[PDB]
Amino acid sequence: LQNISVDYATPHVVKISLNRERQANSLSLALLEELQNILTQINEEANTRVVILTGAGEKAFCAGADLKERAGMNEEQVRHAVSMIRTTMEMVEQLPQPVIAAINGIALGGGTELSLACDFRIAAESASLGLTETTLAIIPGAGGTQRLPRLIGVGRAKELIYTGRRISAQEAKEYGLVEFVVPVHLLEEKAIEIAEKIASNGPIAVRLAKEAISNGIQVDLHTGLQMEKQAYEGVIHTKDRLEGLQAFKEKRTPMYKGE
């Protein structure tokens, strides 16, 4: 409502925009509460197939945790606020639907952490990223130390976290931190395109694929293969799987319904 905007104008896709432009879309407690509420609702939306997360304006995706607010917090409040940010990251990652981060500007600290909590990332050429925490004598406390090395390797994650340096979208692409980079005015269009492609695939299968990958990658390969085996059981008794084969037989585009 106040700190976040939601857009359901695109069939099967929901667009969440951080809306605190004056504060560089930083994560305030109020914003986190609104975002948690929205994520709770989306979690139960069977008709929602893909989520896009972005920031309002052309300067910032998310500048991170709100420092004005952090500056006025005692130790107890700091702990509560960091807990609220961590929990929100978990809610984004555990959504049944794929979540696409559309990085429209600066994504620093908590902002990079937020993008890491998404399934994958698309950035504007003008975007900049970084985990700047060590420059302030703190560390990434919302998964930055964990999600970054998992995505891009320990070496790169270490140099980035130890230096706290800011990097360009192109550098981010080279390192594997962002999967796609596109001109600034084409960001929303490319995110919607990718989302619609995902939305055209079997919704039950896409959800099972997210679970299989996200959970299986956390363990040994042998166990991960067994999780994938159980996940696949989930598409066997679906009408969509039958439509896939029928469309193959009829030589046409399949049309899935999530059943």
Next chain:
Amino acid sequence: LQNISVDYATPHVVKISLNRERQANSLSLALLEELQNILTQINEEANTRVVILTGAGEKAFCAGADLKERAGMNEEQVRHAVSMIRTTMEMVEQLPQPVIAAINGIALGGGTELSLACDFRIAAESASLGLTETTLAIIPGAGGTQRLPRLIGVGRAKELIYTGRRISAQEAKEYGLVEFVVPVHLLEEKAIEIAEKIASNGPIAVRLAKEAISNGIQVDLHTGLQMEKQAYEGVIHTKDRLEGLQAFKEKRTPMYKGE
């Protein structure tokens, strides 16, 4: 053998070719049966040091599961078929010898899964890859959800699996999915020359390296180091190690014998 070809022309190297060109080298249950039988034989071949896996023709490495055969299968049939494919992948992965995928054309779904079960991959410039399963309302059921993120990272694996999009050999190389790209007319000689190099190295050492890397990467670094330590004990008392030392001292090529 009617669905595959096995060639031992090159010393210490065996080349297995999927041989169903008319069917884009798709994986029928009959082909999977033959492949499992040859994999069982190679598993016990001490004279065989490296294996090359490829497809017949210049259009397809492997189009994946045979959908003509899959159509209309009842529940029990589907489970058995997916089981046959996943078991075959495990057998490729667990061969003592290194296995090189020579991707001569399209490698889709089960075809990309088959290439992921190999130690590393060489692709024709004209090859295309992808895990197209979600476009059929299913998920990769033969390790694609597990081996792909392990090789190229979770972010890229997710965008590929969720979209089910096809990518060029060039794109695959950029993402780290294939290790080499060469012209299709040179694919066979490139795979043979890399296989010959590996075959000239100490076979006990190469086999132990495969075991140490493949198993060690599944666990924590500390335990992984202890596994390497035990593996190293397997080479220090060998006659091949002594030949390596003498060859280096005499500045001549070593002639390893697997002892």
Next chain:
Amino acid sequence: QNISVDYATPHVVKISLNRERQANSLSLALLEELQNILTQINEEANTRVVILTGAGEKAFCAGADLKERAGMNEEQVRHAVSMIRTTMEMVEQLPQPVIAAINGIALGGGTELSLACDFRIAAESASLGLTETTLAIIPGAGGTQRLPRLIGVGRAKELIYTGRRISAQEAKEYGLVEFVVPVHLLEEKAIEIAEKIASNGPIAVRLAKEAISNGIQVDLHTGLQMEKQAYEGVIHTKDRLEGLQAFKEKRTPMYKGE
């Protein structure tokens, strides 16, 4: 003395392997002093970053000393091998980040030494490889473990099975080295990066190293719990307050490890 130790800039110690005639190879003597220096640095508050390099323009470290090994049976190979392994563990477990400045060839133990460092910066003319299988052995100081963790299983397998040596440029492509610079600029770029790290909160950098190094070894959920505990280590620090104050005042923070 087979190694030199000097403060290149405030808080940045440069350790140079100094056995140029023997390609900066790892002899027992060098290993002993390297272990001694690392034992000392573990207890230091002044040192915030370590740069590890080799003397000359030809070799970073050629690995295990060949002349010293020439006169070794299976039994002597173990103690030597054990000391190399142990040294690798001391580098990765050191509180401070360690940057490998690869000034030339890195082979066997030398490549393994670079992998035990937090990150690597290489001269344009440097090269790296694990040629062990060409000699019918395997990497015995973590190469089979640290390499796939950094660059993925597929490329680690290709390089280890073939035993091929690669250029700094190839290494950069694979993510084996994080930075590549012209030969004459290796020292100054390693120092520049170390200075940036040394200007950040020392408690925070140290906790970041532990959280990353340990957390990456387990499942994400547990790793996140480790990060949570590590964050508790910065919350009550004066440096954290200085960071917020220096940022507000828009001036350089003066951290004191408190």
